Amino acid sequence: ITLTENKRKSMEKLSVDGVISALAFDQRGALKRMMAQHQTKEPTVEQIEELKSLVSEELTPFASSILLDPEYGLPASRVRSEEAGLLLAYEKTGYDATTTSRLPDCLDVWSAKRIKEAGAEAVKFLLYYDIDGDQDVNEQKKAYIERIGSECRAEDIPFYLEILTYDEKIADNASPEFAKVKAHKVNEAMKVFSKERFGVDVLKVEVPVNMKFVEGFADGEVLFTKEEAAQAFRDQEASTDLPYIYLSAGVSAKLFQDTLVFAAESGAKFNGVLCGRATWAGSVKVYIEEGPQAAREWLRTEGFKNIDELNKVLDKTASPWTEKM
Amino acid sequence: ITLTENKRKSMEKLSVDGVISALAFDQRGALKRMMAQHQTKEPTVEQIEELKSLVSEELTPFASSILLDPEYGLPASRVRSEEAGLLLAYEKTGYDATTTSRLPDCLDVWSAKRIKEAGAEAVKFLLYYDIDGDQDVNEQKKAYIERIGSECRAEDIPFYLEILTYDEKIADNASPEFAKVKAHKVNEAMKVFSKERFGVDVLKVEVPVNMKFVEGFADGEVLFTKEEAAQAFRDQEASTDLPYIYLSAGVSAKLFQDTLVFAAESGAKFNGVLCGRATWAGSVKVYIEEGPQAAREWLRTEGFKNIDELNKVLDKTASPWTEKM
């Protein structure tokens, strides 16, 4: 539903047996903030590019594909395992914090055609979306996604749409107040962007619940029973017929793995993950303070353990996207 | 050079016997300024939408198609002649005069898909381009046209690219200084955007010379001879294999008509025109002052006479785009 020959071939290069076990490292401003916590000077371009190349070289042998940004990640893309596919990010990093609109914007000197010419098997785009937000803002966001979806249809390259939800009136998405509305924000946004007019091939989405407030997982206030959390996962599955994959949102590797198990037990038929920080977060401190060689040894030990255990979990929880397309 | 079935059918709906005799009325800010100089109050949306409808309803019976803007011309597009095709402008009007980059920008809540859904047979986009300008600026512009070209391929709708040339250093493009380089600006820009990667189907371009400085046409200072001018047109013909049409550029109708004859004599194989103010400008004064009914009679008399004379010149100067495709 309903891949062209070329789009199918690219999807196969990004997955194994219909499951996407992709490594995500297109973070730019978020990576800079992480490195800023560990050194005096400002993170330089050589540091950004080198660290991306280390993660790509050491960990892509254990992923079906890697997501990188064209601004700092092109060197890293050339050192990935020959068995791993490539996704390239298309959006500018971050958003304007002085306003609530968080309007999307493509990299200035890039296009879907140039992403394909750079060797990518997919275009990835991040959209911030408040389903309950200003209707004129959301009309502009939907028109923008339509353009990108049309680009990808013309270039015949899969369109991976990442949706991060928020509320114009809630400052912290980690708060209990946002947790109470998160399922609504996520599942209704997925329903909108599963419409044919947007040309999405795979949705990259948050889990529809903040697991730190679910019974059995919560260390403090409990907002949801397990059955209530399970129902949010079943609503998410009932919100789209497209393939969708989960992002880690920077939670610990263990919590993300436990969440995937819970998702599968609840009835969610997710088709993999695009997991970033939960895998390689710890390499940042080591690289900045210890250097590149020490970072390699971290990736070969702690990094491998994160992605290896994730792969074991994906093997028993994820469903193949070939059942949907 | 090649067209899909639907792109070819749309091109036929925009032309007559392979000739494009299109009426241009996508003006917005410029039209508002023409109205402001005839009344005290500020022009209203109702006035703008009504005048576009009068022009569309009265003059489209004598044109192969009409170019309108989605912001005020959608009512006018519905009262157009059944035999006239529709083109819709896609770009935001004007440019920021505080800088020299003149970067393109699409209408916020529009896309090629929505333009097609609004009933258009083609997408029209305007690009300001200085072939000698800042290389990074032009790289961003080229990337931008690639996206729009890809959209139009996906939606299977002809892409009409309008190129207006300028110089980052020369303020007035009507000056003698700019006339001595206009041929370089026009012809070289046509070479760039004739490349397959931009997906252009038709170019809306200026004549490669300021005829007001050509021997026999200039009422004062003479910069070029007819032989030098004729060579500029032959260079323009040799700069693209795509169909291309001339824009009136606001010059007098008589001068524009004489330029089409001179172009055909020099060897230019242009495929039509997109003429606007030179055909209907006189109705603005009548409409604002004498009202909508007086403007209608002006269009049925003087307005018809203008477009009728133009069509008679086109029948003796324009070449069919079917000979290039």
Ligand SMILES: O=C[C@H](O)COP(=O)(O)O
């Ligand atoms: O630039 C600021 C953003 O919050 C960082 O996120 P990003 O690196 O994924 O674009």
Ligand SMILES: *[C@H](CO)COP(=O)(O)O
């Ligand atoms: C998506 C990045 O583009 C996945 O990032 P993550 O750290 O897992 O949330």
Ligand SMILES: [Ca+2]
């Ligand atoms: Ca091999």
Ligand SMILES: [Ca+2]
């Ligand atoms: Ca489903």
Ligand SMILES: [Ca+2]
């Ligand atoms: Ca299973």
Ligand SMILES: [Ca+2]
């Ligand atoms: Ca005619």
